[PDB]
Design a protein around this motif. Structure first.
Motif, mmCIF file in Angstrom:
data_model
loop_
_atom_site.group_PDB
_atom_site.id
_atom_site.type_symbol
_atom_site.label_atom_id
_atom_site.label_comp_id
_atom_site.label_asym_id
_atom_site.label_seq_id
_atom_site.Cartn_x
_atom_site.Cartn_y
_atom_site.Cartn_z
ATOM 1 N N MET A 88 0.736 -1.179 -0.286
ATOM 2 C CA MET A 88 0.364 0.148 -0.056
ATOM 3 C C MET A 88 0.857 1.750 -0.005
ATOM 4 S SD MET A 88 -2.659 1.140 0.161
ATOM 5 C CE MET A 88 -4.574 1.077 0.990
ATOM 6 N N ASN A 138 -10.642 8.034 4.252
ATOM 7 C CA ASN A 138 -11.295 8.109 3.148
ATOM 8 C C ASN A 138 -12.571 7.686 3.335
ATOM 9 O OD1 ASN A 138 -9.165 7.676 1.456
ATOM 10 N ND2 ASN A 138 -8.816 5.323 2.038
ATOM 11 N N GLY A 189 -5.997 3.610 -3.755
ATOM 12 C CA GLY A 189 -5.354 4.001 -2.124
ATOM 13 C C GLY A 189 -6.932 4.255 -1.701
ATOM 14 N N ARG A 199 -6.663 5.764 8.340
ATOM 15 C CA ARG A 199 -6.253 6.383 6.328
ATOM 16 C C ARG A 199 -7.610 5.911 6.446
ATOM 17 N NH1 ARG A 199 -1.822 4.149 8.059
ATOM 18 N NH2 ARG A 199 0.029 5.318 6.311
#
Ligand SMILES: [Mg+2]
Ligand SMILES: [Mg+2]
Lengths: 96, 273, 48, 271, 136, 151, 49, 193, 294, 89, 257, 49, 138
Positions: free
Chosen positions: B58, F116, J43, F112
């Motif tokens: 990632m 998002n 991502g 994260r």
């Protein structure tokens, strides 16, 4: 089970049910003296896609064997063609 | 019948190779062979590419996207800055109430080694190097003794320990502070020592047991990636409870879980939970 | 206006301050002179 | 990466300490855009009941926060101007995004100009990143308590006063200035100064502080009702940490009470 | 892979039964004290002014620029029935039902109720269970 | 001996009439589980459980047959967790708690994903919550449908 | 010439307009109303036959 | 129908003759497309004739008394909320919907519809083992009507709001008995225990 | 969500404070759920349309759905020559202008939602304060074990307001029946005849005839009398709980009490703030006999 | 293929600079990527992992499992005798 | 799914197998005269995403004749996944990709005249629209099995139908099919789940009953001296002193009675 | 039996809302009716016109 | 097994012949061990970390983080939700007023045997109902 495996199997399977398979199954139900299953199956059949496409049909032979078995086995609420009168049931019913 | 996602939607010049069906060029066995091989291998190549896109970590992916994000047409030259903003700052510490003075990184010339320390922090006592008085005795490592210090200061429920300062030692400290086995730690660029801060919970320590891997420096234990992978597995369930700590061929101090991640084997240091 | 309503909220206040800051910082006044105004004494010593 | 922002975490508490004793805690463009990340990373964390931001000062500096670094900003504005000057010079040497009749000169004019605009873009970026950081602090999802120890220049004022819990130690201070450096004040405190409330309590104070660079302190921040909370206790940060360590569940009732009790016992002024 | 195959673990002890849990431990099952608000926290009231911290500015809480109106997030109860459980449950609620006495629960579910002398005071009405005895 | 029940606020008797059956009958797509689940003051697993039971009651009531894939669709995350567990530890059944991994995440581990989510945007609301956003690679599509030999 | 004005002032490359307006039929309370009496409330009442 | 969708079907006005002899004034507005009338304004797809007939053949029954054939019965029977048995509200149910629904119900089981029911047992099915995928749920309403056709909401003014929240801030004032509960209202405890 | 949950808790708590009624958890959440679904419907319809923000001149155009989802970006070739940084900031500020317009629409929509919600609470709320027994005392009046003490000051300043007519009851039901009587009165009259043939008339019968809705058409098919839930006269959730299990009774009771308390505390906070803002109150307690002397 | 495997080894602008392009500008031939995939690819798509999956509930409860007669359940202590039965099954 | 002109219009999403590439179609006729759904050839290359399982984009790529509109004039290619707005289940087509020459549907400006065939209808809830009474019934191709103009109650009458649903008192009413619904967390709690055997999965929930050899001496001792505590394996039995017996699905967290 | 009784009674009899000092009866640090200070206040006043 | 351990295994004293060995020792040992065992959840809390097994609970939170965009992130303009009391409302009546009050709404004698709603509970009551009262009184 066979009837499911007829459309499920990649190698030996048909894409849709053939007529042959339908009247074969119905014949089995008839020959098992299996009433409820025969009825439901018949209705399901005329509810299918193959029926509306015209691919599978109800023939005279299927129709009349279906009716024959309808006649000759016990119906839940009513008396049926092929119910044998018992002479001695007068012990209870009162009429010979 | 509105169509979103194809603007041209129908290419006229475009028709399939099988459908247009141009008469097949007859190649000599040379031609047919060469083409079967080159396209077999371009299929091999493609399969590879896909497999790499699958296996990309990632971090790599994110880097890729904000790399492309900022990308301009011309490769622009760097801009001259202030005399510097770039000195790695010196970690904040208190002069007055103190374990050790935080020593400037600008004094780097003044510093000594773990063996021969330059005079600093005269008002604190100095830890001594632990060495054998006779032959049969074990030869101690500043890992062995690091561990037993922490163990003993956890038993007496102390909040701070002064501890030997070599490379794999403060490596081990950082690893333990990652896993939350230790309240915090600091190196003051003191030569001999640095200091760890212990954590307690529900009346006792956060550390059940902490043991060095080797009693001597004359014994060096090597950990295969498979072994370190065994530790992780408790009869089919993945278990990260216990932490094992490694040197790498690369001079990094790691836990066994990162090690297993990238499949590197490393030298054993200690185990703590 | 000064009414409890007419005061700018935080979003518009930062934006407004920015408008002014942006427009003034261009002028040689700020960057060429006033920035060095508050330097310490030995800073000016070293520079001189 | 820069060791500019350092932190200390307990079970349920999070301490974020700005470490820049050399510049008087003036945050660079990068370091601010960074602090917005640390602040909300700590604030959106699962176990944080309270996130305490303060100034780590090793005894070198008394500022809690500086403004934008005016040294940097002034520097690169000056560079930007210098390049406009050289570009103008050769534009007038040929004349005796600038499109010309001459390839050599179009070339180096456009190089110089593009670079100028890059510098100005770094200044612009600095201002944007500070303003946005302030916004981060204002909108923090979990409680963010700003322990203000020592002085604040404009955008630092902003950083401390807009957290929904802003505590003042005695040493706290606010300097909203900069017409003294030849610029207009920045940092949002302007709103606070123009609240109808302040016009009520201290008519004229708003102009006093905006025009004359002049400091405000704990008492006056309290009276204007800018913030509710005040303490005289040494090293409050430690006590907050270890109090939230003994604390137990995460249900918002428990959290409400724990935080509230802490506030009532120290930061709200009784006795 | 793992070849250890969770299907086949375990040792048959013959007739000996044992308990197992489908998901969590049973004490951790009914959470009612945080649901129905029986905890001291609520009563001390001390920290409830904090649900309303937005009120500390009048002209804002009207104008809704900031989306955080509430203690843990966007609003006071976004969730309230789920989130808090992410803390490992160290001191689980256990069995709270008061519809009978401790002595009646104990009586019904435990053989131990028959032997009131063999049990110390702190455990008297406390067990719901049957205990095997083994004289070593 | 059967007199009392835990959680008196939702009685089994009153969930017999299914809620807003006059709506999600008519366009069951525009009605993902969320819109309904705002109705119950319970936790997640319990309220999805209840929604399944609603769908089934409703279907039996209108004399039509129910979607048997609904418990797979509401519990989708659980479905795949289970398929993959079964794959990993070799067993057939439902993965229970002792067999979860012992990994310990840091406190901010979710950051994260959290930014998002906070920043996601959606053209319409269907895209927002469709049933299949759980799935990206083909592996996912393979585990989510292994059971219908049809699909 | 997106924002570029013409000779006599007309827009070159005509600009994009917003169709957004507040929809006026959307009250949910009359979408799901009471199962027999037609009242628009959210109030659950158990009637008598 | 209050709505955008609610416009009617194609209707006759006669030749030029009867049209000049109908309209006095005529004022025109610019051309815009045709919206096909919704399903409930469409007379051929909505025809309820059979159910209207069923109503009428039962109409004399509606004129007599209600009498319990359990004599000694007084208290009313409770009908609970949301039960499918008691739902009176059709939102989109036309003749169309009612027939789509009828048929799906019939091919579910036929033995619901026989006056003397035969034995009903499940047999196999022609779509597969997963056939429920192609069958289940209830007939679906067309989505254009679901979304657009809804009545216009009668605009709520600011006056009624001001009043409602006035009434809201009236009820939030204290009642004199709650803080210290009178010894007189704490004797009133009864349990079914 | 938040504003609504505050008000609903106000209602629940007030319901048990004033009369001995408990609202079923079922009900309390179903109110909220209806606000939620309202919003959702508004989102459904709001995504069918688009909002256009624009930056410099018209050079930079951004097309975005009011929710804030980005759809198209049109740009002058003049922008292409700037810098990536300034391109970024420019499109970004256009996007911000779009979000501004969309969010303006949205906030209007929200005000609409709030209004429908209030209207839907009104039978409950009014239901508690429109009873022959409902009363309040002034907040600054001392309360003691027997009852409540008189507040001394300014015997003019205290006016008791009354919601209810003291003579025979006139309920809202009677007012709606009055309304339909005047509707029929106007309809049935000449000049109400010629009005019902106008466009105004057929508009009125379009919107406000339910009776003319063809079978299966959406919406109410009769005109409804306003809901009547008199609070002291209707047993709600306390009766079922008190029959079934006492424990749930005591717990639901508890909750209603706690909510009430919480609401009241909030009202005290807002009061306090409003009191400091106008400078009648200090920022730290200066009067401790108002607290410690009980 | 791992870390034990034999090593693979290693002013202006390069040819690797040209091919590259800003995602702000419209690319070459507009291949209709599904938005969701390009989110995941870059991502930024919100994760749904097996970590967000709770207990898999029993929804429709199976059947009563009736006690199946074993060889240790017999009303006579005979038939369980040591000369016949070695255990329940 | 909406109605106009007498026919259906559905929005759908075409997708490659890996769901890498996708195309929306807004208004598609649903016409069941098409044995198999037809797409324009232009998209064949658009929907081709070469994954690991399918090294070429598709599993099947062939030529066929198939002139329905209006010798190899087209291409059978697949699988391709299709999400219709109505349905929860994906429908997997292997469509005809037709070039412009064979059939060109540009029919109105911007409008590509796509339709959906019985390839896709058989896999949807849309199939239920194909049965008598549905909205696709009219457009079925003419057969001996399907009568065009008969009213629905007429047809259904001819098969099984007599009365309305559950109208006769002999057939139970549909909604008593399910009365109680069992959810452990809202009533009586979870089960006490034991096992005897190797695992929870390998053994039975049942303990062994009192008739066991080893339990008899103990159970005896327990019947006689009831108040004192007694050693034995008679503990493990399904029978014991306490009123609460150990048998499966004891609800032990119940606040009973 | 006694403890259960007490529990029920203490729970049904507990006060709620805000008293004259602005706080709940269960508030942490600040109290009401200290040493029957209100009881006596009613004693010597009496309720009469 | 008395504890219900499936996956444990345990050994006493290396070789089984190692001293000391008594039945006492054998029992007390395993009980000692089990008494020193730390549960995993407890271990995780000990380090200030979230256990993998417990993370599913954050999902609904994280869920409507994601689902909050637009129109569900909207709060009504002007309206906080906290409506302070201002005036004082009392609708209470003298009894002769609330005797005939509801009689065009509900039945006459609405307040009959109602003690809280009336200062006079016995008014409006017909005789025999009044008799019922004293009848259960004696
Ligand atoms: Mg990520
Ligand atoms: Mg020996």
């Amino acid at each position: 089970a066979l009837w499911y495996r007829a459309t499920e199997d990649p190698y030996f399977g048909t894409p849709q049910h053939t007529q042959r398979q339908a009247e074969a199954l119905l014949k089995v139900y008839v020959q098992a003296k299996q009433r409820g299953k025969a009825i439901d199956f018949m209705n399901k059949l005329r509810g299918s896609v193959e029926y509306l496409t015209g691919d599978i049909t109800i023939t005279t032979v299927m129709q009349e064997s279906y009716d024959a078995l309808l006649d000759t086995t016990p119906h839940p609420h009513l008396l049926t063609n092929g119910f044998t009168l018992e002479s001695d049931a007068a012990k209870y019913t009162g009429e010979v | 019948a509105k169509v979103y996602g194809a603007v041209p939607p129908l290419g006229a010049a475009q028709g399939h190779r099988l459908l247009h069906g141009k008469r097949e060029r007859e190649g000599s066995l040379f031609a047919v062979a060469n083409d079967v091989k080159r396209d077999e291998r371009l299929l091999r190549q493609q399969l590879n590419a896909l497999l790499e896109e699958e296996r990309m970590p990632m971090q790599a992916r994110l880097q890729r996207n904000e790399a492309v994000s900022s990308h301009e047409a011309v490769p622009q030259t760097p801009l001259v800055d202030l005399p510097g903003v770039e000195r790695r700052r010196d970690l904040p510490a208190d002069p007055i109430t103190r374990l050790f003075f935080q020593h400037k990184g600008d004094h780097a010339l003044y510093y000594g080694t773990y063996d021969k320390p330059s005079v600093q922090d005269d008002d604190r006592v100095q830890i001594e190097k632990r060495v054998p008085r006779r032959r049969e005795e074990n030869l101690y490592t500043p890992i062995y003794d690091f561990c037993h210090r922490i163990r003993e200061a956890t038993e007496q429920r102390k909040r701070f320990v002064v501890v030997p300062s070599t490379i794999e030692t403060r490596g081990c400290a950082r690893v333990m502070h990652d896993h939350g086995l230790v309240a915090g730690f600091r190196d003051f660029h003191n030569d001999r020592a640095f200091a760890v801060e212990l954590k307690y919970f529900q009346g006792d320590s956060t550390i059940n047991v902490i043991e060095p891997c080797s009693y001597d420096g004359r014994t060096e234990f090597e950990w295969s990636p498979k072994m370190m992978r065994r530790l992780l597995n408790t009869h089919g369930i993945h278990n990260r409870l216990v932490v094992y700590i490694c040197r790498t061929a690369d001079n990094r101090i790691i836990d066994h879980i990162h090690a297993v991640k990238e499949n590197i084997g490393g030298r054993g240091l200690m185990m703590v939970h | 206006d000064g009414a409890a309503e007419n005061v700018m909220p935080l979003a518009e206040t930062l934006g407004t301050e920015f408008k002014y800051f942006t427009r003034l910082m261009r002028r040689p006044d700020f960057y060429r002179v006033g920035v060095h105004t508050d330097k310490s004494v030995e800073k000016w010593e070293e520079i001189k | 990466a820069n060791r500019t922002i350092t932190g200390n975490d307990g079970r349920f508490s999070k301490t974020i300490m700005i470490n820049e004793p050399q510049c008087n805690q003036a945050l660079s463009a990068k370091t601010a855009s960074e602090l917005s990340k640390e602040i909300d990373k700590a604030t959106n964390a699962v176990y944080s009941k309270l996130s305490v931001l303060e100034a780590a000062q090793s005894g070198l500096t008394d500022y809690f926060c500086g403004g934008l670094n005016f040294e940097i900003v002034g520097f690169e504005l000056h560079m930007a101007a210098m390049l406009r000057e050289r570009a103008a010079a050769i534009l007038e040497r040929s004349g005796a995004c600038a499109m010309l009749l001459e390839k050599a000169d179009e070339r180096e004019v456009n190089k110089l100009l593009r670079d100028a605009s890059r510098y100005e873009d770094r200044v612009d970026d600095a201002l944007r990143q500070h303003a946005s950081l302030i916004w981060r602090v204002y909108t923090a999802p979990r409680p963010l308590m700003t322990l203000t120890n020592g002085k604040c220049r404009g955008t630092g004022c902003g950083l401390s006063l807009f957290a929904k819990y802003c505590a003042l130690k005695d040493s706290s201070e606010f300097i909203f200035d900069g017409p003294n450096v030849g610029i207009t004040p920045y940092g949002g405190m302007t709103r606070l100064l123009a609240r109808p409330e302040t016009s009520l309590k201290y008519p004229g104070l708003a102009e006093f502080v905006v025009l004359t660079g002049a400091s405000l302190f704990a008492g006056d921040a309290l009276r204007l009702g800018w913030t509710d909370l005040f303490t005289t206790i040494p090293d409050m940060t430690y006590h907050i940490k270890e109090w939230f360590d003994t604390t137990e569940h995460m249900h918002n009732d428990a959290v409400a009470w724990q935080l509230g009790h802490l506030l009532e016992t120290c930061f709200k002024m009784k006795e | 892979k793992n070849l250890n195959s969770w299907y086949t673990k375990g040792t048959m002890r013959g007739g000996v039964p044992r308990i197992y849990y489908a998901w969590m431990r049973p004490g951790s099952f009914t959470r009612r004290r945080f649901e129905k608000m029986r905890n001291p926290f609520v009563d001390l009231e001390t920290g409830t002014s904090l649900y309303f911290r937005d009120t500390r500015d009048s002209a804002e809480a009207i104008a809704h620029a900031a989306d955080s109106k509430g203690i843990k997030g966007m609003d006071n109860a976004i969730d309230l029935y789920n989130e808090y459980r992410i803390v490992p449950d160290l001191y689980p609620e256990g069995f709270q039902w008061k519809h009978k006495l401790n002595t009646e629960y104990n009586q019904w579910r435990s053989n131990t109720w028959l032997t009131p002398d063999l049990i110390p005071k702190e455990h008297r009405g406390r067990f719901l269970c049957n205990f095997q005895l083994n004289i070593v | 001996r059967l007199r009392y029940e835990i959680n008196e606020d939702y009685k089994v008797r009153d969930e017999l009439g299914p809620e807003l059956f006059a709506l999600w009958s008519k366009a069951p797509e525009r009605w993902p589980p969320e819109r309904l689940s705002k109705m119950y003051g319970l936790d997640f697993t319990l309220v999805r459980k209840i929604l399944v039971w609603h769908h089934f009651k409703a279907c039996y009531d209108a004399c039509v047959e129910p979607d048997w894939s609904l418990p797979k669709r509401l519990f989708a995350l659980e479905w795949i967790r289970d398929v993959r567990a079964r794959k990993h530890g070799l067993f057939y059944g439902k993965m229970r708690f002792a067999e979860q991994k012992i990994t310990f995440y840091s406190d901010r581990f979710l950051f994260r994903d959290l930014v998002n989510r906070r920043e996601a945007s959606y053209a319409n609301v269907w895209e927002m919550d469709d049933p299949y956003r759980f799935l990206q690679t083909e592996q996912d599509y393979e585990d989510y449908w292994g059971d219908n030999y049809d699909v | 010439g997106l924002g570029e004005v013409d000779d006599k002032g007309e827009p070159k490359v005509p600009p994009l307009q917003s169709n957004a307006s507040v929809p006026t039929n959307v009250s949910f309370y009359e979408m799901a109303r009471h199962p027999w009496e037609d009242r628009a409330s959210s109030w659950r009442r158990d009637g008598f036959t | 129908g209050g709505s955008v969708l609610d416009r009617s079907v194609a209707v006759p006005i006669g030749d030029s003759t009867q049209v000049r002899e109908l309209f006095v004034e005529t004022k025109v507005l610019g051309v815009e497309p045709l919206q096909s009338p919704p399903s409930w304004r469409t007379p051929f797809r909505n025809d309820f004739a059979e159910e209207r007939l069923k109503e009428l053949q039962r109409a004399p029954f509606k004129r007599e008394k209600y009498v319990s054939l359990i004599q000694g019965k007084y208290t009313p029977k409770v009908k609970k909320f949301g039960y499918t048995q008691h739902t009176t509200v059709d939102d989109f149910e036309t003749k169309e919907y009612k027939d789509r629904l009828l048929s799906k119900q019939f091919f579910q089981n036929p033995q619901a519809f026989e006056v003397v029911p035969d034995r009903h047992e499940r047999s196999v099915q022609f779509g597969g083992k997963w056939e429920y995928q192609r069958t289940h749920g209830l007939p679906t309403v067309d989505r254009n009507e679901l979304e657009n056709g809804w009545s216009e909401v009668e605009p709520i003014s600011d006056g009624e709001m001001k009043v409602i929240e006035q009434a809201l801030r009236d009820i939030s004032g204290p009642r004199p008995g709650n803080f210290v509960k009178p010894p007189s209202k704490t004797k009133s405890l009864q349990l079914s225990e | 969500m938040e504003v609504y949950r505050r008000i609903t808790e106000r209602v629940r708590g007030a319901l048990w404070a004033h009369h001995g009624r408990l609202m079923s958890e079922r009900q309390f959440h179903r109110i909220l759920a209806f606000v939620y679904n309202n919003k959702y419907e508004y989102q459904i319809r709001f995504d069918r349309m688009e909002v256009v923000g624009r930056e410099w001149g018209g050079r930079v155009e951004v097309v975005t759905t009011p929710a804030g989802f980005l759809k198209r970006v049109r740009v002058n070739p003049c922008v292409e020559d700037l810098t990536l940084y300034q391109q970024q900031q420019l499109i970004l500020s256009a996007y911000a202008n779009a979000c501004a317009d969309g969010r303006k629409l949205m906030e209007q929509a929200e005000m609409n939602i709030y209004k429908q919600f209030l209207k839907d609470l009104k039978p409950i709320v009014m239901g508690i304060r429109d009873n022959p027994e409902f009363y309040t005392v002034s907040e600054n009046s001392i309360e003691t074990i027997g009852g409540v003490l008189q507040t001394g000051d300014s015997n003019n300043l205290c006016h008791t307001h009354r919601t209810i007519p003291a003579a025979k009851a006139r309920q809202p039901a009677d007012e709606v029946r009055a309304r339909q009587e005047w509707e029929q009165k106007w309809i049935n009259s000449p000049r109400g005849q010629s009005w019902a043939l106008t466009l105004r008339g057929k508009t009125y019968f379009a919107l406000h005839g339910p009776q003319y809705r063809p079978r299966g058409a959406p919406g109410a098919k009769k005109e409804t009398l306003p809901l009547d839930i008199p609070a002291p006269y209707t047993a709600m959730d306390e009766k079922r709980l008190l029959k079934k299990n006492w424990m749930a009774y005591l717990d639901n009771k508890h909750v209603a009490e706690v909510m009430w308390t919480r609401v009241k505390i909030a009202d005290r906070e807002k009061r306090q703030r409003l009191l400091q803002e106008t400078g009648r109150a200090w920022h730290r307690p200066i009067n401790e006999e108002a607290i410690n002397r009980w | 293929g791992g870390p034990g495997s034999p090593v693979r080894g290693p002013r202006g602008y390069t040819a690797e600079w040209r091919d590259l392009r800003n995602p702000m500008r419209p690319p070459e031939f507009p291949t209709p990527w599904e938005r969701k995939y390009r989110q995941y690819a870059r991502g930024q798509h919100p994760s749904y992992d097996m970590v967000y999956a709770g207990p898999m509930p029993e929804i429709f409860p199976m059947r009563r499992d009736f006690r199946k007669p074993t060889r240790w359940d017999f009303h006579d202590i005979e038939k369980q005798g040591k000369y016949r039965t070695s255990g329940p099954y | 799914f909406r109605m106009s002109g007498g026919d259906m219009f559905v929005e759908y999403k075409v997708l490659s197998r890996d769901h890498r590439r996708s195309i929306r179609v807004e208004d598609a006729i649903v016409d069941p005269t098409f044995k198999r759904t037809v797409l324009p050839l232009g998209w064949l290359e658009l929907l081709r995403s070469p994954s690991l399982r399918l090294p070429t984009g598709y599993f099947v790529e062939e030529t066929v004749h198939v002139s329905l509109p209006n010798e190899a004039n087209a291409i059978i290619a697949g699988p391709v996944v299709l999400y219709i707005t109505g349905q929860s289940v994906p429908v997997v087509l292997n469509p005809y990709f037709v070039p412009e020459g064979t059939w060109d549907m540009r029919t109105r400006d911007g409008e590509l005249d796509l339709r959906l065939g019985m390839d896709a209808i058989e896999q949807c809830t849309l199939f239920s629209e194909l049965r008598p009474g549905g909205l696709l019934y009219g457009k079925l191709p003419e057969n001996p099995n399907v009568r065009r103009n008969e009213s629905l109650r007429a047809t259904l009458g001819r098969y099984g139908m007599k009365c309305d649903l559950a109208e006769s008192p002999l057939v139970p009413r549909p909604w008593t099919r399910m009365r109680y619904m069992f959810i452990d967390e809202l009533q009586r709690g979870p089960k006490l789940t034991e096992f005897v055997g190797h695992n929870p999965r390998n053994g039975t929930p049942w303990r062994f009953s009192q008739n066991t050899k080893y339990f008899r001496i103990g159970i005896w001792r327990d019947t006689i001296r009831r108040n004192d505590m007694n050693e034995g394996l008679h503990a493990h039995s399904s029978w014991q002193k306490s009123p609460q017996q150990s048998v499966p699905e004891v609800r032990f967290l119940a606040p009973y009675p | 039996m006694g403890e259960r009784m007490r529990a029920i009674i203490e729970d049904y009899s507990k006060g709620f809302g805000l008293g004259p000092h602005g706080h709940s009866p269960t508030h942490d640090t600040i109290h009401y009716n200290t040493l029957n200070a209100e009881g006596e206040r009613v004693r010597d006043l009496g309720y009469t016109d | 097994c008395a504890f219900g351990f499936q996956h444990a295994g345990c050994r006493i004293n290396l070789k089984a012949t190692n001293n000391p060995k008594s039945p006492t020792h054998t029992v007390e040992g395993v009980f000692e061990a089990v008494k020193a065992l730390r549960s995993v959840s407890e271990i995780a809390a000990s380090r200030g970390k979230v256990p993998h097994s417990l993370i599913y609970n954050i999902y609904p939170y994280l869920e409507e983080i994601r689902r909050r965009k637009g129109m569900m992130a909207m709060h009504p303009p002007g309206k906080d939700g906290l409506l302070m009391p201002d005036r004082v409302v009392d609708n209470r009546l003298p009894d002769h007023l609330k005797r005939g009050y509801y009689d065009d709404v509900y039945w006459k004698d609405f307040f009959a045997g109602s003690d809280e709603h009336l200062n006079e509970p016995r008014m409006g009551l017909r005789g025999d109902e009044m008799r019922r009262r004293l009848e259960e009184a004696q």
